[PDB]
């Protein structure tokens, strides 16, 4: 009778935002008091749920999506947002029903000289649909001449790395984000509050 939120927040390694990981949360009771009483989070915002009813609501299934973005990009993880992350890496539906939790992880995801293990998608021909993951590393062919999978003129690699250094400003520091999605399907509720 408890949800395995520890497997998500206290994970050793987090995925890059372009390759965000999703863990299925089901057959348990979620206590949001534990989340607030877990760590010190810089961002904890909920959407689609009334503040009074959050502690007394049931949901069909819950998905926990986790990734790492820049500090000033956390504002893009919200319904009706636009930007590099929202359009090409991780898009939330305009009717999103769930909570977005984020916290600074500069002591974990920043290394001296720059931690180049986290990536983000630079551009995509079409904007991402809600809850769409694109891990393709095909070389974008901007010009008429084909690329043949080789970086060069008019042939750009679609992924770029974060320069996560401990000396960066707060807006450029690593932030771990967890997006809890609440599904209202006509099925027995596997996650409730009371």
């Amino acid at each position, epitope marked *: 009778n408890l949800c395995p939120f520890g497997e998500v927040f206290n994970a050793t390694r987090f995925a890059s935002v372009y390759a965000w990981n999703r863990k299925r949360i089901s057959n348990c009771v979620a206590d949001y008091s534990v989340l607030y009483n877990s760590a010190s989070f810089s961002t904890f915002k909920c959407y689609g749920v009334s503040p009074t009813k959050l502690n007394d609501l049931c949901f069909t299934n819950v998905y926990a999506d986790s990734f790492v973005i820049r500090g000033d990009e956390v504002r893009q993880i919200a319904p009706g947002q636009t930007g590099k992350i929202a359009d090409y890496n991780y898009k939330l539906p305009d009717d999103f029903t769930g909570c977005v939790i984020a916290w600074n992880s500069n002591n974990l995801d920043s290394k001296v000289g720059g931690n180049y293990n986290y990536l983000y998608r630079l551009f995509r021909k079409s904007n991402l649909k809600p809850f769409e993951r694109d891990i393709s590393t095909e070389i974008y062919q901007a010009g008429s001449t084909p690329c043949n999978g080789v970086e060069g003129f008019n042939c*750009y690699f679609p992924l*770029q790395s974060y320069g996560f250094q401990p000396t960066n400003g707060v807006g450029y520091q690593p932030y771990r984000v967890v997006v809890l999605s609440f599904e209202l399907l006509h099925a027995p509720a596997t996650v409730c509050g009371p």
Partner: antibody
Amino acid sequence: QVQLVQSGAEVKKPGSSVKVSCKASGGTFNRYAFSWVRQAPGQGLEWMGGIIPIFGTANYAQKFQGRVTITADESTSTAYMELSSLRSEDTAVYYCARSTRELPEVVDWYFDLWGRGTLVTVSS
Amino acid sequence: DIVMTQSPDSLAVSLGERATINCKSSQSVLYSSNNKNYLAWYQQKPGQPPKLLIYWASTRESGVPDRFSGSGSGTDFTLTISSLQAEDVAVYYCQQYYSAPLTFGGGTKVEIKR
């Protein structure tokens, strides 16, 4: 409507570095291709390199490879050119030119809009 | 790289007479896949940036007057001004955008014979 504004003329001591700006005012900036074309006094046009800011990675001419660094700041719609290890031959006017098409379409690097030019003089 | 050679270096033409500028490329800029020539013509008045006149070796840019024409295919190309005007005295460059590095021609200065 759209115009490209470049930094003022500068004089640099030989062996130093110079950085010239190029601001695009009134249109899209990220999806275009911005190049830097050099013209020595009395000489022809010479392509130094270019960049599509949305991809962040620039492509240089082999002649200037290693000495020129072309970048762009998408939040200010400004493209930069930095030329290090300045020599007497580097005295020229530095133009910034924008491609005619945007990134969703096919970007062929022939340039429809130009900057008024920045003259960089290298002397002691 | 594809080096661009122009001929002549300079020519003098009376008002309203025909002006012809040549551009030769060391490698063919006619792409086999699309059957299009990746060649452009520019105009540079003194003290001013270059101005795009012709692209695809035959297509005029919007606003360019009808007296400017582009012809040629492969390695030999031609810029033609049917009747030269006083406001046309400039240096004309040809550019290839087939491959990197992008290379321009030596330029051709046209002046009015009056």
